[PDB]
């Protein structure tokens, strides 16, 4: 109980020092794994226990109160990352670079504002910088979060539904909701090779996907066969380890550059 204290105790000065930070995961296009962003997921690197995973700290920052600042941070630091490799290649194809929002951030007073100075500092094109919204946050009042949506999209941000299946039905909302990203959970990307449901819900989000015209990005691809099974359904865009995992920023420049070079 000792060690999970001191860690929560640490979230006082963690985040600005900078030490909760994003490393960035690949989104390919499956059929010829062209890159076409990154998510931004935090890492805390501890400077004396190393690389923590979310699952880990999230639920202490939550105790502590502080998903805000944790939120500005990751925005920050995403949109800074994705400035610096913007003005380092200049002729590239689209690059975006995608953050989770905090739960509970859809609706704080201010986040649009946080958004468009975050968008304006680092003079991003629009849709460049992506919010992934969760089901949850959503869902808790569909209507209000429909509003929210469209003032984002409008200030310049990219968005994405995050966590569909945890329980509220966005499904059958999201024709109401202005998302242009729909992203399905590892858990039936995994399970659709021998359970009948889960393939049937991959199925289905695909084709709601083209017929609502968003973009469809399958996660937790983790290797060939299932990149392939995914690419016959539809789905023409994933992230998972069969490409690569989050990435620190020194790593993710070489995999993107190698992108750059044979595009
Ligand atoms: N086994 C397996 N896992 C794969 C594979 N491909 C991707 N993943 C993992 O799946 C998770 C996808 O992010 P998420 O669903 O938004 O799920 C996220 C998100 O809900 C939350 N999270 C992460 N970063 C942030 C952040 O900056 N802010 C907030 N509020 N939440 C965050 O923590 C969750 C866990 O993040 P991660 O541990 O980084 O775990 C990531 C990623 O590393 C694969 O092929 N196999
Ligand atoms: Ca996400
Ligand atoms: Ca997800």
Known sequence: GLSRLALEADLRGAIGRGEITPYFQPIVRLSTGALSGFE????????????????????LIEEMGLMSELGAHMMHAAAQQLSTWRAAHPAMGNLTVSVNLSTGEIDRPGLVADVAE?????????????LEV??????????????????????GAGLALDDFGTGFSSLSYLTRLPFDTLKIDRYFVRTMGNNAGS???????????????LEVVAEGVENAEMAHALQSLGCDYGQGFGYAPALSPQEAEVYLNEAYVDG
């Open 199 to 213: 393939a049937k819900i991959v199925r289905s989000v695909v084709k709601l996907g083209q017929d609502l015209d």
């Open 40 to 59: 931004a997921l935090a890492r805390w690197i501890h400077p004396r226990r190393g690389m923590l995973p979310p699952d880990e700290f999230l639920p």
């Open 134 to 155: 969760t089901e949850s946050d959503i869902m808790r009042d569909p209507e209000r979060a429909a509003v929210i949506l469209k003032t984002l999209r409008d200030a």
């Open 118 to 130: 975050t968008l304006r500092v680092n003079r991003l094109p629009r849709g460049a910088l992506k």
